Write a protein that binds this ligand. Structure first.
Ligand SMILES: *C[C@@H]1C(=O)C2CCN1CC2
Ligand SMILES: *C[C@H]1C(=O)C2CCN1CC2
Ligand SMILES: *C[C@H]1C(=O)C2CCN1CC2
Ligand SMILES: *C[C@H]1C(=O)C2CCN1CC2
Ligand SMILES: *C[C@H]1C(=O)C2CCN1CC2
Ligand SMILES: *C[C@H]1C(=O)C2CCN1CC2
Ligand SMILES: *C[C@H]1C(=O)C2CCN1CC2
Ligand SMILES: [Zn+2]
Ligand SMILES: [Zn+2]
Ligand SMILES: [Zn+2]
Ligand SMILES: [Zn+2]
Lengths: 191, 190, 191, 193
């Protein structure tokens, strides 16, 4: 029906972090803590940090899924528009909005019962002298895409799961994929 | 040795596979990274046919296994003596690859190369869908003693017209194993 | 052609298991994982477990055969000492080292060409509560019997075959038949 | 009762346990609480347990470890790994066994044929030249929190010294918590008092 977006830090103290990028014209990805909202460009690197209080064990996986924010649209699967879904696809299904770049162990799922799309990578701990793990996501349509997201806001849900799929952690953030993230962030904050 | 050269041809013939993931319970899962299908003995292994334009009536779709390794490549891929034992329906008992849920299936023992293949009529996608799905079954395990014996194989898929002329070709590696999800997840860890 | 001792799990994921019996004076059979060696008493029950990932068909058979481990003895048939051959249960040939107890469908072979002894039983799936199938082997000579094994080490080769004789899998283990299995395991491990 | 004996006894060799004074820093993988007689440790990591004696036991002496549930309503339940961790093995240990010994090739595992309890045994070796106690490195192979396993029930490890013929010589015990953050979990449990 609808996957849960309820924040769940769980046993490992799972939290998300984001670079402090600002709102200048050069910025290709910028997070608003006031809005809990990422502003990023089509197909460009979006860094997401995983912060934990304890290290989950090897075989832990990190999954990302998008849903529609508005209750009227929430049961609709978030997918790429017909224009963009036309098969640079590498290892990714052409319909999927969310890709991970720079990870050979990436796995993509079409849920056989919910038909929802997700992308999964193995959780790796931070490098020694590092405090967080970084996944580079790419968003493969614009929020404005006719016949896809069509200006409807989306949430990204990031779940930590054990090797059997059981929930260990869940966080979420709103996403706008737009041409001018710095400008769009600064304008959306000024209201 | 049968040609394994990718050939989209005149109708833009491509293969697709479900995005099944690697849950322990999955019956069949394809690794885009390895171009490799992981599936269970005698269970459904869906293969999608995608075309840019519709092949003419009487087009056929053939599947044939060969060994991947150079020094096993002339050897005909067939079931182990244990599994070859009769028990089979429309399929020859020695054939590794079957098609299920197609009453028009045809099986060939090449009288000259002795290779096994399985053929069906090409049907366009059903109402609503963008691809044609063929349910293959692999009737030995990759680890069968006296059969494949842990040796890797490729499946070659060919689109042919009514007269047996080549229209398209593609291929993928196959592992027939107890737990496809685990085995894909493990093989991808390198 | 000395029989093959090469391990094959095969289509059914065939391996061997043994009870974790310890080395107390009272123990009648104990297996050493570090030595891959079973220590047992003359004529006493020696449980050997069959573990499979997938159930082979009814009609599947399980064969045991002993061979000398040392290369210069490998071509000699392993058989009971003169004393011990001269006792029988009424199914076992008096020269066979390995019997199966508590199985009315046991079959014994003297190979027409090699002259090697083996004992076969039907494969049955695990009983309810169990993840493995247990065969009770009896070894009918002592390792030290002069005129039989005469302290020469031996392997038992366990083969899983179908109703038609086709080989499905193989595994093996070393055996010592002795008065005090617990003490001999403890002593041999202590190198 | 049916449950095996937990009562402390130093016996003839004056047998007792010791534990390193490791503190509670975030990096610590195991830490013992003298106030709680309780060892906090991480899944599958080294857990040093010291054997202290007044006189040297004969060669052939053995040191056995066994886990029991602490709470009287669970005491008769055999302690074993959860079904998930049973599926994950060094080839010497049974996959169901909670307690392993690391780095001892003479290790022996027992499944009791009548109690069905698990235990792990090693030979007693005297202290090396320039040491005053023998150290065994235990590994605990399931979390305290594991569902279908300990399921948050506290356990005791019972350490027995026994002769070559199985005669009990001494017995000691300690509570154990297998957790993600031993340092943090020891501090929190000590501050309720
Ligand atoms: C891979 C696993 C197994 O080992 C059996 C068959 C399929 N899944 C679930 C049980
Ligand atoms: C990116 C931008 C849009 O196009 C609408 C949805 C999300 N965000 C606000 C309005
Ligand atoms: C475009 C289409 C194809 O033809 C294959 C690659 C991606 N997509 C599904 C299968
Ligand atoms: C087993 C054998 C038969 O008896 C007929 C069907 C299949 N195979 C060939 C002919
Ligand atoms: C399934 C697995 C095997 O058993 C061999 C062939 C293919 N794959 C790698 C090796
Ligand atoms: C049982 C014991 C013996 O008697 C010799 C052969 C195997 N093992 C070691 C030496
Ligand atoms: C580690 C912790 C737990 O999870 C329960 C048992 C022992 N300790 C206290 C409660
Ligand atoms: Zn788009
Ligand atoms: Zn086979
Ligand atoms: Zn004898
Ligand atoms: Zn566990």
């Amino acid at each position: 029906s609808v996957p849960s977006q309820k924040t769940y830090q769980g046993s490992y103290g799972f939290r998300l972090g984001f670079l402090h990028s600002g709102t200048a014209k050069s910025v290709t990805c910028t997070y608003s803590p006031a809005l809990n909202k990422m502003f990023c460009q089509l197909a460009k690197t979006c860094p997401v940090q995983l912060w934990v209080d304890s290290t989950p064990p090897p075989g832990t996986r990190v999954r990302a899924m998008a849903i529609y924010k508005q209750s009227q649209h929430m049961t609709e699967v978030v997918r790429r528009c017909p224009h963009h879904e036309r098969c640079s696809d590498g290892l990714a299904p052409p319909q999927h909005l969310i890709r991970v770049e720079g990870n050979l162990r990436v796995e993509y799922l079409d849920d056989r019962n919910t038909f929802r799309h997700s992308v999964v990578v193995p959780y790796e701990p931070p490098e020694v002298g590092s405090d967080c793990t970084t996944i580079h996501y790419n968003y493969m349509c614009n929020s404005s895409c006719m016949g896809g997201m069509n200006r409807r806001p989306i949430l990204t849900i990031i779940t930590l799961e054990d090797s059997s799929g059981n929930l260990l952690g869940r966080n979420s953030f709103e996403v706008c994929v737009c041409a001018c993230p710095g400008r769009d962030r600064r304008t959306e904050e000024e209201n």
